[PDB]
């Protein structure tokens, strides 16, 4: 017949191989395809949707207080309000986001991010903020004179209640890794900080402690590769009733 | 020669695989095909044939009394005569039918049914019946005012001795399952009930207890998939003389 020989790699079950396999139910007629709304054909559709950052990932912020940042009227000039760890691949405010949870199924990621901050004060509350994306290399900037040298956006509080801090893809490498080393040149992204441009100024009938909801999506520049399993989920024992699926 | 490698699934005997195998008797000449009458090329030919329901699946109906429903003259108004469990896949009056026994070789079924009721009274016996297919969700309707809101047919007893209660395919899903759960939204079909429209009225020389033979076939809408082995047959031990087939 046909003179063949087995290569190395014969009879091995690679999990990610793509080969046609034997149909269990022959001449099966699957259910006809109905137009179900909202088909995802590519996971970067899911990533480019905005999703809330937990910038307030502190203690004494229990549950939903972690999603908003309380900013107040300040008596000092040009004070730091918050800074955001930009490690998508590591634990931090970007982790439980749509750009974060999907990228923790991957290792190498590229493309520009997109931070959107929705002010949730009163309509009478007037204020201005600066949102400085500092490219990495140095420490997180604590004064505004240090931070506004980087990429920033200055935001007035009026009719439109949100800016977009585009985090540009500034990297030497084409992609960026996970390493468990947040301080690596291949993994570190930079630092987004926020400072009072002027101040949060409310009248006597508005609440003095207004809020900021911080979103992050990715852009059309964004890309992911080198798929891995997510570290966001674990499994110590069998789940409950999993033994009852066999009974 | 040809560089090959064994996939997962090599050397395994799937029962339902479709591969050309080695002929035991080479250059065999099979017997020439003769036109034998009544070829079935598709099992839905067998299903679309009418076949008697055992609506009288009670005790004290021994054998053939289960195939007919005894209806009588009634002194009360608008009384229930019979109701039919519509679970083809489960045990009930539809089980020992051509639509039932073939569909118990399958799991998922679609398409409209077809109940035909042949009156077998005298020619002098005059009567009227309503045959209400109630789509599922609620209880089996016990009064006629409850049941005639559903799909029904009103049937006069004259020259033609049979109606067709078309059970329309009313389902959310494309198909319907077997589950051993007759009360499931994926499995339950509804309830066919029968009520006296007027009454069964016989003269003094006809028998007061006339009969109804209930048929069910399927329509051209009907369909079956996900083939399984039938629960209608079992095998506890070896059959008799099966050891003598080896001797």
């Amino acid at each position: 017949g046909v003179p063949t020989y087995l290569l190395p790699g014969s009879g091995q079950f690679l999990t990610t191989d793509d080969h046609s396999s034997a149909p269990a139910l022959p001449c099966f007629n699957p259910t006809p395809e109905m137009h179900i709304p909202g088909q995802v054909r590519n996971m970067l559709e899911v990533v480019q949707v905005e999703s809330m950052m937990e910038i307030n990932n502190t203690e004494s912020a229990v549950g939903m207080e972690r999603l908003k940042v309380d900013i107040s009227a300040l008596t000092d000039v040009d004070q730091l309000l918050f800074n955001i760890p930009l490690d998508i691949q590591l634990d931090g405010p970007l982790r439980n986001t749509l750009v974060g949870n999907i990228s923790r199924y991957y290792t190498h990621w590229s493309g520009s991010l997109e931070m959107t901050f929705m002010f949730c004060g009163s309509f009478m509350a007037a204020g201005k903020l600066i949102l400085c994306y500092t490219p990495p290399g140095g420490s997180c900037p604590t004064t505004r004179e240090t931070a506004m040298l980087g990429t920033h956006i200055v935001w007035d509080f009026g009719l439109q209640s949100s800016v977009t801090l585009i985090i540009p893809w500034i990297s030497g490498s084409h992609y960026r890794m996970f390493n468990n080393d947040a301080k690596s040149t291949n993994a570190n992204v930079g630092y987004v900080t926020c400072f009072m441009q002027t101040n949060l100024i409310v009248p006597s009938e508005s609440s003095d402690t207004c809020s900021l909801i911080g979103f992050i999506a990715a852009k059309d520049d964004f890309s992911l590769r080198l798929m891995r399993d997510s570290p966001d989920i674990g499994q110590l024992d069998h789940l409950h009733a999993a033994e009852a699926a066999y009974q | 020669g040809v560089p090959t490698y064994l996939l997962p699934g090599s050397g395994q005997f799937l029962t339902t695989d479709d591969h050309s195998s080695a002929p035991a008797l080479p250059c065999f000449n099979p017997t020439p095909e003769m036109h034998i009458p009544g070829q079935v090329r598709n099992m839905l030919e067998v299903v679309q044939v009418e076949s008697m329901m055992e609506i009288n699946n009670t005790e004290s109906a021994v054998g053939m009394e289960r195939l007919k429903v005894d209806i009588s003259a009634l002194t009360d108004v608008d009384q229930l005569l019979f109701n039919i469990p519509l679970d083809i896949q489960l045990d009930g009056p539809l089980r020992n039918t051509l639509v039932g026994n073939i569909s118990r070789y399958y799991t998922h079924w679609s398409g409209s049914l077809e109940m035909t009721f042949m009156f077998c009274g005298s020619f002098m016996a005059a009567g009227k019946l309503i045959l209400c297919y109630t789509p599922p969700g609620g209880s089996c309707p016990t009064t006629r005012e409850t049941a005639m809101l559903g799909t029904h047919i009103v049937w006069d007893f004259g020259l033609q001795s049979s109606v067709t209660l078309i059970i329309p395919w009313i389902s959310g899903s494309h198909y319907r399952m077997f589950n051993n759960d007759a009360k499931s939204t994926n499995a339950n079909v509804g309830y066919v009930t029968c009520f006296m429209q007027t009454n069964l009225i016989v003269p003094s020389e006809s028998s007061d207890t006339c009969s109804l033979i209930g048929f069910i076939a399927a329509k051209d809408d009907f369909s079956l998939r996900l083939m399984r082995d039938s629960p209608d047959i079992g095998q506890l031990d070896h059959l008799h003389a099966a050891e003598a087939a080896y001797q």
Partner: peptide
């Protein structure tokens, strides 16, 4: 059918020769 060898005898069995002449046996006369 397949015959990936270099020798014509190494092929499969030639089960196609339907030419028969029974008249050299049933009628062997002149």
């Amino acid at each position: 059918q397949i015959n990936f060898y270099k020798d014509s005898y190494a092929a499969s069995a030639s089960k196609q020769d339907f030419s028969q002449d029974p008249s050299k046996f049933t009628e062997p006369v002149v």
